[PDB]
Ligand binder design. Structure first.
Ligand code: K13
Lengths: 99, 99
């Protein structure tokens, strides 16, 4: 679909058999989700945003469906202010900026 | 034009008679630019993201040209690690997300 930016581009995602709302974030290299339980192994990592760095758990090769489009990639889980879908997954669903 | 998200969507902007590289960021509510000496009055503000909040100066009705598309609106200035074009100006240049 075509999404205008008058409001936050929030969309429903499905990860680990659970529905959630997430922000399509072209300014994020990576996908960061709020605290949740995900199966499989994970590795501790650090990510930095506008206000500093936070500790996150990195989950690789995770299936996640964004607005009816499937993707399999890395998902970081930690104390982010909001679920954000970053470019690592936006590319998988064929998302582009157009003006 | 169309911009893919394989790499950061950086573009050239023109503000206060200066050319800069800025990020087209659908996840950013409002434009925030790296520290620069803009004239005129301003109002303090704090914006939050990954890692916490930063203090910025809010300038109103600032003219910015993004990829030859003129815009005018709020521009925040503060210790951001990167110039960010937010939704408040992306709408003005007709920018949409598409997949
Ligand atoms: C609350 C939603 C989202 C986190 C908000 N951010 C925009 C976001 O695009 C930032 C914009 C951003 C990009 C680069 C450095 C600092 C901020 N990206 C980001 O934090 O991504 C992180 C996750 O992937 C990694 O790639 C980029 C940093 C990591 S932000 O920078 O903090 C921001 C908040 C309010 C305004 N008005 C303008 C910008």
């Amino acid at each position: 679909p075509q999404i205008t930016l008058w409001k936050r581009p929030l969309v429903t995602i499905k990860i680990g058999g659970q529905l959630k709302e997430a922000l399509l974030d072209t300014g994020a290299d990576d996908t960061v989700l709020e605290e949740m339980n995900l199966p499989g192994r994970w590795k501790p990592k650090m990510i930095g945003g506008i206000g500093g760095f936070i500790k996150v758990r990195q989950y690789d090769q995770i299936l996640i469906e964004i607005c009816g489009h499937k993707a399999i990639g890395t998902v970081l889980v930690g104390p982010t202010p909001i679920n954000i879908i970053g470019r690592n997954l936006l590319t998988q669903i064929g998302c582009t900026l157009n003006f």
